[PDB]
Paper text:
SOCS2 is the substrate recruiting subunit of a CRL5 E3 complex that negatively regulates the JAK-STAT signaling by targeting substrate receptors for degradation and blocking STAT5b activation by competing with receptor pY sites. SOCS proteins share a conserved domain architecture comprising of an N-terminal extended SH2 subdomain (ESS) that functions as a bridge at the interface between the SH2 domain and the SOCS box enabling ubiquitination of captured substrate, followed by a central Src-homology 2 (SH2) domain that recognizes a phosphotyrosine (pY) containing sequence, and a C-terminal SOCS box that interacts with the adapter ElonginB-ElonginC complex (EloBC). SOCS proteins serve as substrate recognition modules that impart substrate specificity to each CRL5SOCS E3 complex. Here, we determine the co-crystal structures of SBC in complex with phosphorylated epitope peptides from its physiological targets GHR and EpoR.
SOCS2 recognizes two GHR binding sites at regions around pY487 and pY595, respectively. We therefore hypothesized that the two copies of the GHR peptides bound in the crystal structure might mimic a physiological folded conformation of GHR, presenting each of the phosphorylated sites bound simultaneously to SOCS2. To test this hypothesis, we utilized an 11-residue GHR_pY487 phosphopeptide (NIDFpYAQVSDI, KD of 2.3 μM by ITC), mixed with the GHR_pY595 peptide and SBC in equimolar 1:1:1 ratio for co-crystallization. In this crystal structure (hereafter referred to as SBC-GHR2), still two copies of the GHR_pY595 peptide, but no GHR_pY487, are observed bound, yielding a structure very similar to the previous SBC-GHR structure. However, an important observation in SBC-GHR2 compared to our other co-crystal structures was that the region of SOCS2 corresponding to residues 134–162, also called BG loop, is now fully visible in the electron density. The BG loop connects the αB and βG strand of an SH2 domain. The corresponding BG loop region in SOCS2 is either fully disordered or in an open conformation (SBC-EpoR and SBC-GHR2), suggesting that this region does not participate in substrate recognition. Nevertheless, interestingly, a similar triple-stranded β sheet structure is observed in the SBC-GHR2 structure, where the peptide B replaces the first β-sheet of the BG loop and makes backbone interactions with the BG loop and peptide A. However, the crystallography data from our follow-up experiment as described in the SBC-GHR2 structure is not consistent with this hypothesis, as two instances of the pY595 peptide were found bound despite a molar ratio of 1:1 for pY487 and pY595 peptides being present in the co-crystallization buffer.
Author numbering:
A (entry chain C): 16 to 112
B (entry chain I): -4 to 6
C (entry chain A): 30 to 137, 139 to 198
D (entry chain B): 1 to 104
E (entry chain K): -3 to 6
């Protein structure tokens, strides 16, 4: 589908565009990976160790990265508060983005 | 206006 | 480590910045920095034969270009007159830019000169592409502290932070 | 021209975009294609103020400077069950831990 | 950290 659901460790459900979610290399390997043609497939990805405040920030990066890729628009700063920077760094490395 | 190419001078 | 390995690491760090534009003419740099604030900079390939890197900066009188000299394993700014001990030189070209951005954090608005020989000023870069979320977190952490080996992080990620200690 | 929004209801958050000149009703049609509920069963909010279908997103306060990709604006969403609407409820996100001693 | 220097560009 056009959108995909990403569920955080505390149960928050984020619905983002599929092309935006493919910015993460880990998610891309999951949605565009092996499977069974006849079997049903879930359009939800569960993260058991990514909290909602971090996962919401990752989704904003998905919008930020796709918007300013192959574009003539000047790229503004991406605000990252220090209070989440380390949690965000661990999640970014885990998602390959 | 500034020239297209310049070099630094420490002052 | 030998000279080729130091230069290779310096070029890798350049590619991790996000403000390295590769092939870019003088006019294309003037267009991208025409309305940018004073201090906006970017590093591109040098059209000259004896150079490799060039800084395009927005100054008080418009966009200009500064060629980066590479002599004896160290990067230097092109200078009209120099004393060797008084010109900063580093193995990493990103370290050279980070050095001057830090120095120009205490640069003089109303107190600045209004007419005369233009003064150099470097602040924020002009990204050609959005860097990875990991690198953006690395910059935020670096702008927050320099003692990364006491942070609650796995040792694998502490090596990642050590690979790029600059704030720009 | 493009505005970037976070449509939130309970524990559900939708990351979507629209045009500043588009209307609230057209935003309810985008929600209809995601949460499978018609616009007449939806109520959109900007903080406490209820948005009406006729106003454009820019007229409601969603401009290119307050609804950027790296900082999207939040739109409240309330659903209708039977005759009366539900009260606006948005579940907060988690809290980050206190900063380490060496940080800041 | 480094002390400020007035750098002219010519
Ligand atoms: Co002067």
């Amino acid at each position: 589908m056009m959108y995909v659901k990403l569920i955080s460790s505390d149960g928050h459900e984020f619905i983002v565009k599929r092309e935006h979610a493919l910015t993460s290399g880990t998610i891309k390997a999951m949605l565009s990976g092996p499977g069974q043609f006849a079997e049903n497939e879930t359009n939800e990805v569960n993260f058991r160790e990514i909290p909602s405040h971090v996962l919401s920030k990752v989704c904003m990066y998905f919008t930020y990265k796709v918007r300013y890729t192959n574009s003539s628009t000047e790229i503004p700063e991406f605000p990252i508060a220090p209070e989440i920077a380390l949690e965000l760094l661990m999640a970014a490395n885990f998602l390959d983005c | 206006p500034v020239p297209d190419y310049t070099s630094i001078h420490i002052x | 480590s030998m000279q080729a390995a130091r230069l290779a690491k310096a070029l890798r760090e350049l590619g991790q910045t996000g403000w390295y534009w590769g092939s870019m003419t003088v006019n294309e740099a003037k267009e991208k920095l025409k309305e940018a604030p004073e201090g906006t900079f970017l590093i591109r390939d040098s059209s000259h034969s004896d150079y490799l890197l060039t800084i395009s900066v927005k100054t008080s009188a418009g966009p200009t270009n500064l060629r980066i000299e590479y002599q004896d394993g160290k990067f230097r700014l092109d200078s009209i007159i120099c004393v060797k001990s008084k010109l900063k030189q580093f193995d990493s070209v990103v370290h050279l830019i980070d050095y001057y951005v830090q120095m120009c954090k205490d640069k003089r608005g109303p107190e600045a000169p209004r007419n005369g020989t233009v003064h150099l000023y470097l602040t924020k870069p002009l990204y050609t592409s959005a860097p990875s979320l990991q690198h953006l977190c690395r910059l935020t952490i670096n702008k927050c502290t320099g003692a990364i080996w006491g942070l609650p992080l796995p040792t694998r990620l502490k090596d990642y932070l050590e690979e790029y200690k600059f704030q720009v | 021209m493009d505005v970037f929004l976070m449509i939130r209801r309970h524990k559900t958050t939708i990351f979507t975009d629209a045009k500043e000149s588009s209307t609230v009703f057209e935003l309810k049609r985008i929600v209809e294609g995601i949460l499978k509920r018609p616009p007449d069963e939806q109520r959109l909010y900007k903080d406490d103020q209820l948005l009406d279908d006729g106003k454009t997103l820019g007229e409601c306060g969603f401009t290119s400077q307050t609804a950027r990709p790296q900082a999207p604006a939040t739109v409240g969403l309330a659903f209708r069950a039977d005759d009366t609407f539900e009260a606006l409820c948005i579940e907060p996100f988690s809290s980050p831990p206190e900063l380490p001693d060496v940080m800041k």
